[PDB]
Point group: D2
Chain length 466, copies 4
């Protein structure tokens, strides 16, 4: 009847959520449809007024929401603060950008001979809401993935059924209360909690669901997307990354090693755009690896509520097990695994780990490692840096470190990624800008402007003047 939510730090019970049946989730979708009929009939200015009010509340509750993220998600408080502050600015940017993002066209159809009589026509476009959006959240950004999916949906007039990860659902429940305090109709966003195997399918198959937006793994996402699309439903998918960091021989080693450490091990490596594969020109390999090792041993692994904590635990036992499979696989294939930093024995603390002499047939170079394992590969050439970088089924983001920007811009043309970052982190994202990638990183882009267009239908009106 309820599910217990435990801190991955100390396994203490943080709160509980309803264990929903298929039937109760069917009811939440029918209620979200009525919420669509309400919110879609409100003028845009009242909807953006609600979004600006949510923005201000999120700033006022920053510290409370950050502590909650630290407890359920194991995200160090300093990183938890940043996520809540991004969600605040995202809700505001959705308010601010709606007028221009949703703006239609008056087409110059007299430019075209077909159909005949275009000189007597007015043809305009508008962006219409789709209806009910199913939003399936990842565990790792429970407040900011909420904002990415819900802020745009409200701006355009859609309702949302939100299914947070059962690992981190309490954030989503507190976000709903903030939406109601901001003046959002109770029916316009419905939180559903439960096990994926009981409530997953109804959220994807119900005839009243117009669209499914999902952040999660490639395996889980592509199956769900396939089902959604089979019933004529629209899909936005932000799936895995194995983002490479390329360090060229003319790199600033101090900067590149500092940013690599932070990019790989922030939130114990549980980022879609963490620096997951490190590719270093042989000329600087030993200097880079020594600087990297020093910086990883200097991090504080411990309680995420502590101000001095750099790194917390991974989310659960399932993740610990997957990460051990990965370290075993790598030792069994000639990899040099080194444990660099160990946290308390209280929960799901995973040792900050380095793999040297990795090979392309290892789990650490061919799958998404959502944990604090840094594989570092030596290369001889830019060409070999490019091939190893592209050698994954992923294509989210990639970083190049070089004092030679002309050279980095030329390598960037040959990297198959949705973003290339020159002299900065794979972790960089702008919540208003396109985010996403090529290949199996997902489908569409997610960001306030692109999400609003992906969440609306273009509608033309053509008048023939008589």
């Amino acid at each position: 009847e309820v599910i217990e939510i435990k801190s991955p730090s100390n396994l203490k019970v943080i709160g509980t959520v309803k264990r929903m049946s298929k039937d109760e989730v069917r009811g939440e979708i029918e209620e979200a449809y009525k919420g669509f009929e309400t919110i879609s009939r409100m003028p845009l200015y009242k909807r953006t007024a609600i979004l600006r009010k949510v923005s201000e509340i999120l700033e006022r509750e920053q510290e409370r929401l950050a502590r909650l993220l630290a407890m359920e998600a194991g995200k160090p408080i300093k990183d938890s603060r940043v996520e809540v502050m991004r969600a605040s600015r995202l809700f505001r940017q959705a308010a601010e950008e709606a007028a221009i993002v949703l703006e239609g066209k008056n087409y110059r159809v007299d430019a075209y001979e077909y159909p005949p009589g275009n000189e007597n026509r007015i043809v305009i476009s508008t962006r219409e809401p789709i209806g009910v959006v199913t939003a399936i959240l990842p565990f790792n950004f429970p407040i900011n993935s909420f904002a990415h999916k819900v802020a745009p949906a409200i701006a355009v007039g859609n309702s949302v059924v939100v299914k947070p990860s059962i690992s981190t659902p309490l954030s989503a429940i507190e976000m709903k209360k903030i939406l109601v305090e901001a003046g959002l109709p109770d029916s316009a966003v419905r939180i559903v909690t439960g096990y994926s195997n009981e409530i997953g399918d109804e959220l994807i198959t119900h005839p009243l669901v117009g669209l499914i937006t999902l952040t999660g793994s490639t395996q889980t996402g592509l199956a769900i997307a396939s089902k959604a699309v089979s019933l004529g439903k629209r899909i936005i998918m932000e799936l895995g990354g194995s983002d490479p960091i390329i360090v060229l021989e003319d790199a600033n080693i101090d900067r590149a090693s500092s940013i690599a450490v932070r990019a790989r091990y922030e939130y114990a490596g549980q980022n879609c755009n963490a620096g997951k594969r490190i590719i270093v020109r042989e000329e600087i390999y030993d200097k880079f690896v020594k600087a990297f090792k020093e910086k990883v041993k200097a991090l504080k692994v411990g309680d995420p509520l502590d101000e001095s904590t750099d790194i917390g635990p991974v989310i659960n036992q399932e993740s610990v097990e997957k990460l051990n499979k990965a370290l075993e696989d790598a030792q069994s294939k000639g990899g040099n695994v080194e444990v660099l930093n160990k946290g308390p024995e209280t929960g799901y603390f995973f040792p900050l780990s380095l793999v040297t002499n990795p090979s392309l047939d290892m789990l650490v170079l061919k799958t998404e490692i959502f944990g604090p394992i840094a594989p570092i590969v030596s290369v001889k050439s830019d060409e070999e840096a490019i091939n190893i970088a592209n050698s994954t089924e992923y294509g989210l983001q990639s970083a190049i470190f070089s004092n030679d920007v002309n050279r980095a811009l030329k390598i960037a043309k040959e990297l198959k990624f949705g973003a290339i970052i020159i002299n900065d982190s794979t972790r960089l994202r702008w919540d208003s800008l396109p985010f996403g990638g090529f290949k199996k990183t997902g489908i569409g882009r997610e960001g306030v402007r692109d999400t609003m267009l992906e969440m609306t239908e273009n509608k033309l009106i053509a008048i023939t003047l008589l």
Copy 2:
């Protein structure tokens, strides 16, 4: 081994095409991948010079391509000429608009606090080709659906594997020779012919296929889309419609009935945006229905190659049987089926037919009728017009006839369609503008501008200036 192509007018043999095996189609996708590697490395001005040359060749070969359409597709020569002129114009519009449509951004990232240090960044976007496109064409616009899929793909640097309908593949083989004459590398577009059930699956599941664009039936499309998306491939779908024409009591009756007749019966009704359901205000019902019948009986049904033919045959026996079943279903459910006009008995001529007293349980009101059957419904109010109009699983285009545009524009707001046409045909399309709609009418939009965006990936480059 070959497949015989027969005219639906007189059943005579027009030509043959290779019955390709799975292994031969595998070869074509491999060669198309080499075509991608070639075409993607040419500068855009060279690709656009190829597209302007195709445009000029299409204009020069117009009468020869029009006659071939008439013979394989049964499309009257007058409508065949219009189709080849549209494809001419589309190839040119892809050349002309590519510079502006593919234009990227220089983002004002210094407007945003996150990530910190945006005042020191340049973030630019470019549109990158996806790679190999699988284009699955419908029978009803063999040349213009070719143009809609191939011209944007060449503009953006994708290669294409083209599977025409086995009913109308001869057009596509003639389009390939025109591409080669225009200077396109032979590897850059590959025509596959054969049975949908022997070569369909390779074209959807081959690892080298990045995207599937398809025009066809809802059931066919959604199954293909489902499979493609399960493998991480992008999809553009233009599936059916059941476009309603709403005729209000204050319409111009002569104009509304003339356009409603052309809208339903053009190409024997085989158009995604045919006027498939006609909703008439009871005040003018008798006058409209009477004007409608006189004009249907004035249409000439006959041989597509005769200059005085208005209406040719339907495409094959399978269609005749689907269309009898819709007629029989209407008779049995209280519908009055009246035949108005009958062409020769020599192939797949289907009588131009009218159904009065239809009901929402009938096939002629709840499915796409891809043939010359016009159901006419009487309504008392605009509210009733809107509820019948919206009652389908489709959402392509709708028309409203009314001398009152103010009322037409308010009704427009409540119609769930990709386009609403005020005082003109459901048939209207602007080949550069979005075409498509809501619900199971498809995924995405198809037009020179929209197809180019859907056929490219956004790629960010972010420089942090040191």
Copy 3:
């Protein structure tokens, strides 16, 4: 040494401002240049944070600023409230729209064969601030014209020297204090007060002034613009209107007469887009004129601080004199002048007045009447409605009243105005949208989006990759 500001309602002294010398204004411009060096180096996000803070303060001070407008400008409190609330929303829209409005391009220069080698180039654009803006305000919107000129200038990084009308300078002084409270650097906006004949020229000719934005009369504006442009300075000019209201025989007479009364006599007619010339089809002339007369006699002319006041005085004796010249001119040429409504004898109350049988050689039909004089012209045809409407050197906005929107859209193609309003007021303006006109209405457009582009220089950066 000081200039006294008097209420046009009761001539009571409301406040005083410095009588500035050429020398002191030279000093204000040199200080605004230093303000440019400061504000242009602040990141955009801090500038938009200042603009959002100004937005909130203007809401908090709405009633105080509205009373001040009522006292110095003679604007009834209810209209004064609306102006302050528009200035609030304008300062916010400038904050909200900057990121997207200022966004540059990444040009697809490989679309072009010239110059040769475009396949090896990156070409981007950015919007740069111009430097120091001279802003010359009208008397009639002292707070909202302030916002139109200052909010965009701050968003883009320009400094502003603001010269309010000597009729209404106290508003501008209170706006500066609100800018400082919001965190704007003291040097970034300088208020100058004085007589045009002492300080006018320095504000237009100083070498440090990059741009002049002016709302005012055509005669004053075109002289200033000529001087600015002679020294290579940019210009935005919002000058006069004589906006026509066209009432067709199928108009809603009740609505058209109500909106005409309000459009002509709001703020005693002192609006650039007041309904200044009324054009009525003869078939409804007597019904319209009787409805108009009734509604004008029912208005309350009196103290603008009173809640029940509809109409206040004109601004000064100079205006009273110009309006008498106009009424004398019209009586002397066969016009039927009728006084409909008289206010107190305390100040510059001008009688609400109607002229019937006007002719095209009268001041009331050929010049801007910035006072409560309504000329009404009878016409026989749409063609005569169009010729009389276009028969002025102005082209700001024009309104058509008709239940036939198809007909009004066709008349709209032949009206030489920057905006045509169908079934609504000439007074309509959207502060984010283009506002302005053809002919001698001015130069450029004024609105948050267009003003930001007019206040920035496009800058290209072209990199040839080596």
Copy 4:
């Protein structure tokens, strides 16, 4: 009465043109107004078909038009061919881009509270032609400045009165016959020839002239602009530049000196964006200056019609005298004037000359030198490079040579220019892209896209739905 056109190469008579009176130019503006009334009523697809035909004729007549440019303008045939190909491409780009550039908006007015009732409004924008354009052409690009002014004007529906430079009017008379051959009405473009001081003022002040677009000198332009704006006419101005080339210590010296030579001396230096001031880092000064001199002495100065000529004459005696005065001024102020290369003594050949040890008081550093005189300055730092670069009243384009793009991009931020070129020539222009700059370099931008917007008026239509 006629004016003799003489070749600046050998002073021989190339042709004659009418010496038009004020009364004859009055007639031409009247006929152009009738041309506006005709061309503005044609649908856009017809006007664009005329522009694509002009493009094809220019390509066919390329060698004949190139030879005429060589003879009247003294422009070497190799550079003349490039000019006629650019104009060919520009006419085509005006045809191709008109549909998207002129596209209006459907504003989301329901995002705004003011005016009340925006939820019931449709507000659309269109681009309307202004009417008659006066195009005043410079001598140095007689055919491409024609294209830049006439092709956008025809695309948007304006008529044009074209006053070519009396030095190079024969090209424009040949362009008119091509327009007529393309199908343009004869009334739609009117060539005026005569003395600037007899017909200049009618072309600027006639009441039927809506806009003046001019390429020429700063002093000429600003006086004309001043007059036009005093009468309420719109203005586009492209006036001088003194583009600096900055060459950093880590530049490719061979490339920087080759491009710097071409940049300064192409067409004897008579380009708005010539490399007019060359700023070299003291570390490479001696090596650059030496490579520079060898390449200048390798250039062939001679007859424009010879295929091996690199550099022809300057345009007339007035130019030779302006250029001697700049030389004499430099000698007297401590400058070392070295002649490097001398063409024939047969017309207006001017020696290719170099000035070392220049000073900021010299004409060769504070004015536009429209001839083959290259001042080279030594600098110690980037800070000094930037201050010299920015020291002019001009702001057209600047170039930076550097293998370090990161440093090139940071310097780019501090240069006050309309475009900065990294590792390429100041000569670069993209005829579709903005061209122009800051300060007294002009008003507005000139390119297919920008010129079309500057040559149209925004017109809003706002419907309130009853």
